[PDB]
Amino acid sequence: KVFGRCELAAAMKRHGLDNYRGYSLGNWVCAAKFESNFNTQATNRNTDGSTDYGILQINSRWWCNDGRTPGSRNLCNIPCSALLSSDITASVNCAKKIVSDGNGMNAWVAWRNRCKGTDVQAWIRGCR
């Protein structure tokens, strides 16, 4: 599923991401824009052989199982395919664990390089 911007904002807010760990909703929408272009089916291979999955590009090296990242962890206890569903519950629950682990949203490289320090409220402007 390719979410609309305001559609994703509403889903993220309903699942409790707005101000989670102090990160306002626009931070999460901006991160999703540049991680996946709002596409739940997005996948990208990393240099180390792990893969990033879903709207927030969660990495099989630590967070989910895809059966092809030898030596990785599965800290969210889910198959990586669950992060590609049109229903974003699994991705949000896993993102909550990631952002709680010490480095905040710096865990998302695209957030650090393209969202951090910018006017992230722009990403929820106009939405109901």
Q: Which of 3, 8, 26, 72 binds Cl ion (CB under 5 A)?
A: 26
Radius of gyration of the chain measured on its C-alpha atoms: 14
79: amino acid identity, one letter: P
Name which of residues 6 to 25 contact Cl ion (CB under 5 A).
24-25
* Active-site residue, from 7, 18, 48, 52: 52
Name which of residues 65 to 124 contact Cl ion (CB under 5 A).
104, 121
**DSSP assigned state of 75:** T
Q: Indicate whether 54 belongs to the interface with Cl ion (CB under 5 A).
A: no
Q: Measured in Å, how far apart are the chain's first and last C-alpha atoms? A: 21
18 is catalytic: no
Q: Is 101 annotated as a binding residue?
A: yes
35 is catalytic: yes
Stretch that binds Na ion, among 29-37, 62-70, 83-91, 93-101 (CB under 5 A): 62-70
Comparison of 26 and 54: residue with beta carbon closer to Cl ion: 26
How far from the centroid of its chain's Cα atoms is residue 80's Cα?
13
Binding positions for Cl ion, rule: CB under 5 A: 24-26, 104, 121
Binding positions for Na ion, rule: CB under 5 A: 60, 65, 69, 72, 74
Binding site feature residues: 101
